[PDB]
Amino acid sequence: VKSKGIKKIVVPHRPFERERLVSEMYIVGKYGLRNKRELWTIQKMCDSFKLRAKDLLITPDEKEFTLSSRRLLKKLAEWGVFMEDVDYNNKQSLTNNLEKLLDLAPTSFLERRLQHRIFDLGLASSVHQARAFIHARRVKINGSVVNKPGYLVKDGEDGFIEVVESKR
Amino acid sequence: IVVVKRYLHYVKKYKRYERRYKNVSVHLSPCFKGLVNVGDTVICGETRPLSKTKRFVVVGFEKKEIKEKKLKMLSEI
Amino acid sequence: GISRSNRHKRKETGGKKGLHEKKRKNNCGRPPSNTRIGERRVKQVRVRGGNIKHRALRLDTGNIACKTHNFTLNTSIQNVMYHPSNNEFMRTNILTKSAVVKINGQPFKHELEKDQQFESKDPVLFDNLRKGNCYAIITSRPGQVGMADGYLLQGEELKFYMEKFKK
Amino acid sequence: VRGPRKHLKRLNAPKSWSLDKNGGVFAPRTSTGPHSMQESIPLCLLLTRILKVASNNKEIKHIMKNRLITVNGNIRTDSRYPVGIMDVLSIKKTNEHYRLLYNIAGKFVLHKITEEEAQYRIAKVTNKKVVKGNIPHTYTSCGGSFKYADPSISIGDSVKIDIKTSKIVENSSLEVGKVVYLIKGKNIGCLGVITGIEKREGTHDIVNIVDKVGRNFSTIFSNILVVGADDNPWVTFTKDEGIKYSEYEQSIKEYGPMNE
Amino acid sequence: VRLNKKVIAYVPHDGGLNQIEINDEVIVEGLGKKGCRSKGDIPGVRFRVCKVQKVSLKALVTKKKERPA
RNA sequence: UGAGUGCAGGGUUCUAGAUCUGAUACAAGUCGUAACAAGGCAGCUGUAGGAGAACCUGUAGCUGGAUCA
RNA sequence: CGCUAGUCAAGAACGAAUCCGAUGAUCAAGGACGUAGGCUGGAGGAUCGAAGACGAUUAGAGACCGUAGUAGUUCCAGCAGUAAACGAUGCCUACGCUGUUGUGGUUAUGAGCACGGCAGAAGAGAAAUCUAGUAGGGCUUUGGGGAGAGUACGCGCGCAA
RNA sequence: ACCAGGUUGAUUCUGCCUGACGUGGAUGCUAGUCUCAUAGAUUUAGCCAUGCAUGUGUAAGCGAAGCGAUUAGUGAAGCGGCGGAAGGCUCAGUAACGGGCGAGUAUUUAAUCUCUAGAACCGGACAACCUCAGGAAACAGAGGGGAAAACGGAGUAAGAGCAUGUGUUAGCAUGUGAUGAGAACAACAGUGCAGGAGAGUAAGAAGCCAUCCCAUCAGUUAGUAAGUAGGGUAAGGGCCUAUUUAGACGUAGACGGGUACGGGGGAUUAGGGUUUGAUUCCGGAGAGGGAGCCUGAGAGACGGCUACCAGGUCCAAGGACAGCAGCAGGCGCGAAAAUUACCGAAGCCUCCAAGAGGGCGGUAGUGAAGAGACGUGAAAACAAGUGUGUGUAAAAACCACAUGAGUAACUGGAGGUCAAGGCUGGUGCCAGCAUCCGCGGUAAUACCAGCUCCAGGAGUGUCUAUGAUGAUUGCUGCGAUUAAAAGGUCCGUAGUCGAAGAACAGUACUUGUUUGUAAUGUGGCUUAUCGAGAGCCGAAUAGAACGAGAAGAGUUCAGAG
């Protein structure tokens, strides 16, 4: 049926391709994700930014290039993903940095997720018990609880994250 | 009288054109009676309906051209 | 009833067309009014938007204008002499626009006699008026406007129409 | 359809009204009146949105049953009455006065004014006719009619109206160097000064304009109202004086020009 | 029922023929080729049985459910 | 202005029918053996006769022939 | 399309300082020709020989082989419209390596122009081989896994086939 | 912007079958929590029990009975006024004014706006009221009063058309004239109604351009094509009729037949494409099938009327009534689709209204059609429960605090394609399995089971259409010596295609400016714990208006051949 809402995953063309199976298995294992759908969701997000960079570099006009480059780079800096010293009002560096985006990887999006941040900031003994503190309300940000492990943490929120003891 | 108008239509898939035409029946007045004939080109203006098929009237014409009935030199030169 | 739509009409290429609607009132027609000569009888018809139209069934008289001398008079109508569309409307004496009619000439005779040049300007009209012949043409639409009005035939108009009457 | 239309679906209503798509299926169908339906707004949208003074239909009723609201000097009692451009709105209690104008985006907006500006409006001249008893008349864009005005006023000029007497006060014509306001098109709500006019036959005249901060833009005469005797404007315009910026310009102005 | 033709259908499972009586109602299904075509080694048969008396034949054969009776 | 209904015809789509005649599948039934080797008369294309049946015979052609001579 | 003379029209190629000036390429519909075998009428009838009849050979031969024998095989006036009608390679127009051998004209005797054969090469192609090399030049015909099927129904031509 | 298995004793090719992946319906087995969408379209535009979906009154049109009164009052039966022509449902018919873009006439328009703008007398009835009183019911009679801003007449303003001057063209002058009206009331301090001229809204008719398959459908048409004159209409016009002229349309596909609600848009997609559109927006048509119609500003109306045909319902047998392609609901038909639920609240529409009405619309209930975010433990310490408050029209859910606690996985597979066992027991070409290739004749990693593994996971298998796979439909981009495939040879029309040199012109061609897109989609930003979601911004297709450039295309010339 045709109805509201987008679809956020793309199914792989070959269901039993051995190099894909092994490399996916590793990354789910290491990062403590629920199933293959969590991973595929991040992959589509990553692809979208790569497409924008491609389009910008090949555009003929200057007005669009100067306008939309800035927006793309600023956004990815705020998420804490693309960390480099982009200088504005300088055409060459904008081109240089756009080229550096083109080999961005899903690992970089994964490491901004709250489940990984909690463990990485040494507030939990494993990526597993980090998830188990996001459930059951033990994790709090700016004085308010966050129930969802997929919460992507912007650059500089790290000062305000906290854990509290269990209710028992 | 019957006037033909001609034009080209672009077919997107094959990236090429086809020739087309349409027939329009127009009113000719007695003031033009001897002057306009087959092959000539004519300018017509729009009006309210005159009959089942007729909506334009001939308002003037451009006569199918002759540059010159070419010169013949005198035999004396 | 009667319709003015082109539902039933063929295409210009000679082919038939299919019907895609039942009839609509906004293209209704009405039966002809056949105005006869006689004592006045006129009917009032309620028309679109609540307007009124006046339909003459029988008429006795008309206003008739003289164009050269610039006066108008009111006179009885005798009979139709000629009708351009159909020979039948003449023999049954039906009134329409462009019908040519015989009328009482005496009022016109009394007025035109005042001009000392009258005989010299139009001898054929003068002769007709002596012989008791007086002819006019109707300009109004009796079935629409509810009355008949016209002008007296003079000069070359007489010369033209009199040739249509003669056997 | 067997007869005249009564309803108006929310997705079909003018983009100038700026109403939220998701809340309900209908919108108010303006009553017949001064301006066209495409160039005006019903009064109940003004009181609930543009200038918030009611929040429910019961309150909208009450305000007008008590006879509070005055438009062009007359008290109004139809909630669906249309108001248009250059159209003084007022509440005599608390002595408030407003004109109706466009945002730079082309939406409608109310602008607060003093009791001086509240005395006049501007319209455009559409036709001239002589009427039974040999009486000259003139007519304007918003269905206005005027008896024994100055005969020299020409079709296409713009006229200033005194709201209390309902007479014409001043007249201005379409010439080089005068101030113009933009009613419809790509550049709604812009304000500028005439560079040059190119005359066309049997078709609209093309007018070329310079903006106050340098930008040229041209449009057809049918979208322009002339809003001053020569140099400078009659009516007071918005907090921002009708300058429109591209997203490109907004970026340059925010982060600085691209250096060599 | 829908055409008043009489057709041949195949009965899939191990003991499947025992789950059907004469004058039972059955629902019938396609074999999965592009046109209606024979599949495997069965000559000239073009459909297979799916349900008997409103219940799944797979459940009947494997004794997970019983006849409506 | 016309609904309905008489009587003849047409145009479409389905369906019945004594009997005849095609095709396809026939584990392997009966009679021969026409083709593939110079397959035991080299094969094949057109046309015309004939014949249980493959096919056979006259006439013109072709090599994809058993001969690049 | 193959004996010799005489006669009657038109065409191809070659030589060259003749004339006219875009008159041209390809082609549904429409029209003319088309080996052999066949058909309608006339002439004729040597040789060969479908059909038909015998003699042998074989389990059986109705066939192959031998004896005999008719329609046809020839000519004039027509109908018909198919072939392994094949170099199984559409028609105009290009760009393209060498050696050798023909046919007809012309020649500074060095060569050319039109129509061919042959042998390598380089490219090409699944190979065999090359009318198949290079290529978004123009226009028409035409194929889309085997079978059923070039068959059924309708239609057009033909005396019939 | 991608491949794999399958003709042979092996090989290299042509070629088709099958797998692997989106999406629309149907269905098996299994199912913890919360949020956003959507549901008798496909078959029968088949048939329908019941209840509801359209009515409205003020200080201010007329006011009967009743009640009551020192000649007051009341409170309203009917009449009048305004609406019932919108919205809701469906896709039968239509190859067309059905669809896109421009333009504003040859037209009519209750309400509403601006300017302007009204000295008028007389008479009956109809309904309700009162007295009889019919009929099985549905529905009606006699007789007698009496009102209006209801209705008909009188005068009177006004006044269509016709003719001539003058200003196209209003206007004015003059002659002639059919027709022929009109509302006030209340003071809580206002509300109405007559005439004009211009607007505003809505239709009717028109201009240009685009539109499906069959040639085993090649000729079609005679109001057909046109002219003159008249009738008719709100209005142009063969729209209709009389006499004259023979036209109009076709191989660039006429005419006939089959099929179809049309767009904005949807699905797939590197690009070029291929498929669909009953279905939130716009426009069209219908109300069992056909046809006629009154009233009105507006209907050829069906929750109006009238007749036939097909079907029904009640009767006292004489007659009456009725039409769910509105909302619930029932029966059928099918492989196929929810509650005879609440609603002085949100968005809007209707009236004579500080109020009344609305199944239009909103709120929940039901269902693994679709789309988000999360449970099923951690190494010290875990959903779903419950109670208060909130929330709403009232609710439930959601959220806040406080109490208990310790519950929570299945579907398809394991010989190759294709991830994962020659494990143990039965069966012996049986029973079965297998999209394809193939397994089983007593030593079956392939059947039937046990046990371990694999894949996705609140989900997974199957069937059926379609897009991709596919350069197996080829514009980009395939083939025709032998694999399927160049007409036996010429002539030839329509069609498609056509030198050099010197000049010329602007309609195609390309481009500027201006128009032309609500939703959806595209580039962004901001707020619901997060993410779909919601809100605001910017640019945009095809199509049209006006300019510009002249290479290619086009037209002409001859001291060129």
Author numbering:
A (entry chain SJ0): 2 to 169
B (entry chain SL0): 79 to 155
C (entry chain SI0): 2 to 168
D (entry chain SE0): 2 to 261
E (entry chain SX0): 72 to 140
Quote from the publication.
We show that microsporidian spores contain hibernating ribosomes that are locked in a dimeric (100S) state, which is formed by a unique dimerization mechanism involving the beak region.
To obtain a detailed structure of the eukaryotic hibernating ribosome dimer, we fitted our atomic model (determined by single-particle analysis) into our dimer map obtained by subtomogram averaging. This revealed a 100S particle that adopts a conformation that is entirely different compared with its bacterial counterparts. In contrast, the eukaryotic dimer interface observed in S. lophii is located between proteins eS31, eS12 and the 16S rRNA in the beak of the SSU, within a connecting bridge between the two ribosomes in the dimer. This suggests an entirely different mechanism of dimer formation to those seen in bacteria. In addition, the beaks of the dimer-borne ribosomes are bent towards the large ribosomal subunit, in a similar way to the structure of the MDF1-bound 70S ribosome isolated from E. cuniculi. In the hibernating ribosome dimer, the P stalk is orientated towards, and may even participate in, the dimer interface.
